[PDB]
Symmetry: C2
Subunit: 501 residues, 2 copies
């Protein structure tokens, strides 16, 4: 027996029209609310007003993609998929009240998947029920244009295509504008919107901080494994060689660039897929990432944070073993110290002994095996972000998720493993369930996020004192079986690590 | 937290190799086990053997489709979607034990979606956990080839394309053989396999009963809203006109036919979608259905049940308002007896008063409003199936799902609405949840099924006495708020209904 209501529920009035949703276990749920429409390679526009009451209880179309996904690690990251269409500008909402006086914090989730794949529902753990219920906040999860639909510069072919290089980012701004006008009708506070995102999602978030059109549409930000530097380089340069190549492959003349709007997506994607790698090999622009211009300034640490971005408090995180997705080639729980020492000595040019001592100091409770899966891809750039933002005068908290899992003998925390905990959705991701361990940590991290968006201070009785990071001193909250806060704690570890590879 | 295990779980060995799954809430789960491979338009063959232990914990690819779903009624039927690939011949398994001696009943689910769409996971309610847990059965859910990949006759263009007209069915046979050979290792009884399906899956099931190569691979059958006669006609006749049209549309020569195997599915599908309508108008074969031949005899009532088909006991059902998916143009519970009489008399040509009398006799508890949503499409052909099979010596139990739902003012049971009840999955389909009503009925129907697969007898203490239907006495179990068994109870109703249109 689960609680469900539909008929006698209040109708919700948005600027464009009336909607109805459902209620489930006390939670008001709306799906596939269109926030904008967009013709191909053009800026998003408001939806048209309708009459009568429209049902919003079905997930909307997700954005078309260049390639087909191949999920083979669903225990690590449980996924969901959905029909694709260019009418994909919708959002989903979970709330505890439709009273306009409720004014609860609004959590605005931007999915990852680089800038080319994914959606508001692409992970099972993106479901907002638990976050909304346990935190009493309004959860908004959003779709926006991806790959060449959201990140392809066609402005050299007319002002009609102005801003097409960052259209996908313009969509998120459109969604934020919808939230400003309408979130009160879902019990949310338009003056307290937090944008948060992971991986590509984190990059979209840090991008919006550096996007003047979005100033004032959100008031906090949270970036999870979403700073990686030159390992996911943004695509820059002249777009004409790519477009010219695509027109030829599609049998179009250069003065027929307008036809690219209405070419079937399958063909458009096929043409891009075949011709772009030769362009890439030539060092040229191929899109599918943001691209600095008047609309998007570029990243803070590289070009300087805007004045407004300095005023956005930020929580940032990474996990211990980000891209170590594959199985460790041995049993971590049984390998002998002698075997490990040989492996280290071979991998790190004879610096195994020093690396263990330094690792013992940084990570006292960890087996030395974990040196082999330690992340240096996201951690480095994220620390630089924390430092650069703090130096700019900003307010920033930093964490590192280091929980080991009941899988392949204490597998270290992998990319996206913290998403269930932040969403209070460990029940939706089997592998994250650890007796006497996971429930506690999930509450610790989740209550911290809630405190963060309610007061600007994530501190609470269940976790150690967590100060803001400063320019010369990062305070890293290590989320684990035993939570600790450490200071500049892996500086030499990373220095030694990189020196030895 | 919930129970999860992976490490040190029993490895299961199949003919081709060793597999590893996981455990969630006590249930052993395997996903995406490949049971066969197939080249386009060719019969399935066994997978290649492998060394070592392969993890099977990710849902496999589902079959490519001609059109893209447009889900707008997700409260009625919650769906899931997944990446498409022609390497889609896989199945999923839920079991309470991997002990080879358990020998539990096997539930083999075949999804609907005509013969062109859907997958083993296409509805949230197809998940096997609860049925496995509450029934202590081994649940198997399967993908197979659909639309033009599974049902398209390429016989006249060689011998390598033999049996292509029913390749989709041949896939299901191969899957059944996989279960014969391997289900012991998942604590199942290969000598007690029940094949059940809904809509198109029900048709695949009745087709398999008439498929001699499938004889002995299952011992019981359940068909849900899966007999529809000349409203979903099977496609027969010369296939050359269709093929020749597709060749032409694809710019292929009369003997470039081999290219059909390797043309992108997109082009192949688009060519079919373009040429098949005109071919259908001219009364020609367009496939995408089973096709009577030496492999599959045809439907029992039409061609005569095979000797082996008569040995298979069958539970059959429909629901009250099958294709009544759209909303009623008024409030069902508000409308006046005067306003209704008009609408009834408009639609049934003045036979309103007579129909209300007959309907009140057939459905004594129901508002006369439900006359407007009464199913005739499935119910009539289903009754003919029940009679034909019983006449031939078969054992058939018949039911009709008539529950009214807390949605749009007591909306009548729609196509697929009983699926969550059969699967003990009302907790996964929010609209089916009714205080003090749905749990009770879920249990009644579920235990009925469990008893049916355990003993051949669906009768149990929670439900009224359910007799087999005979050649002249249809005994219909009416599953509702109050369950009843009725005899030949809607014959006069359907007849009156029919003439008054």
């Amino acid at each position: 027996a689960k609680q469900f209501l539909y008929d006698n529920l209040p109708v919700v009035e948005t600027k464009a029209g009336k909607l109805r949703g459902y209620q489930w276990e006390g939670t008001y749920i709306f799906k596939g609310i269109r926030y904008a429409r967009a013709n191909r390679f053009q800026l998003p526009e408001e939806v048209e007003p309708w009459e009568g009451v429209k049902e919003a209880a079905s997930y909307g179309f997700v954005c078309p993609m260049l390639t087909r996904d191949h999920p083979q690690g669903e225990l690590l990251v449980p996924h969901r998929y959905w029909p694709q269409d260019e009418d994909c500008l919708s959002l989903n909402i979970w709330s505890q009240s439709l009273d306009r006086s409720a004014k609860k914090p609004v959590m605005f989730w931007i999915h990852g998947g680089a800038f080319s794949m994914g959606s508001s529902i692409e992970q099972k753990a993106y479901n907002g029920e638990n976050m909304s219920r346990y935190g009493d906040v309004v959860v908004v999860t959003v779709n926006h244009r991806l790959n060449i639909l959201g990140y392809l510069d066609l402005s050299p072919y007319g002002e009609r295509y102005a801003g097409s290089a960052n259209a996908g980012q313009a969509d998120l701004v459109a969604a934020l504008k919808w939230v400003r006008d309408n979130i009160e009708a879902f019990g949310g506070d338009p003056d307290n919107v937090t944008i948060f995102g992971q991986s590509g999602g984190g990059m979209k978030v840090s991008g919006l901080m550096q996007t003047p059109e979005a100033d004032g549409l959100f008031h906090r930000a949270m970036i999870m494994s979403g700073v990686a530097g030159d390992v996911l380089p943004y695509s820059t340069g002249d777009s004409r060689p790519l477009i010219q190549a695509m027109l030829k492959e599609l049998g179009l003349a250069e003065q027929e660039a307008g036809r690219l709007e209405t070419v079937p997506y399958y063909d458009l994607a096929a043409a891009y897929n075949r011709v772009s790698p030769a362009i890439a090999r030539a060092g040229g622009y191929i899109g599918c990432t943001p691209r600095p211009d008047d609309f998007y300034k570029g990243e803070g640490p590289a070009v300087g944070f805007t004045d407004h971005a300095k005023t956005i408090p930020v929580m940032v995180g990474t996990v211990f073993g980000e891209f170590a997705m594959m199985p460790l080639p041995f049993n971590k729980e049984t390998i002998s110290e002698a075997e490990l020492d040989e492996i280290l000595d071979k991998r790190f040019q004879g610096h195994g002994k020093e690396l263990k001592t330094v690792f013992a100091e940084a990570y006292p409770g960890k087996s030395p095996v974990d040196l082999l899966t330690l992340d240096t891809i996201f951690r480095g750039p994220t620390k630089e972000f924390v430092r650069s933002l703090a130096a700019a005068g900003g307010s920033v908290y930093s964490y590192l998720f280091a929980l080991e899992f009941p899988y392949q003998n204490q597998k270290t925390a992998w990319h996206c493993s913290d998403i269930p905990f932040i969403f209070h959705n460990t029940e939706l991701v089997p592998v994250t369930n650890i007796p006497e361990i996971s429930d506690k940590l999930e509450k610790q991290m989740f209550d911290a996020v809630i405190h963060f968006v309610e007061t600007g201070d994530p501190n609470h009785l269940g976790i150690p004192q967590w100060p803001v990071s400063t320019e010369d001193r990062e305070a890293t909250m290590i989320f684990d079986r035993v939570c600790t806060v450490r200071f500049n704690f892996d500086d030499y570890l990373l220095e030694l690590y990189k020196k030895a590879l």
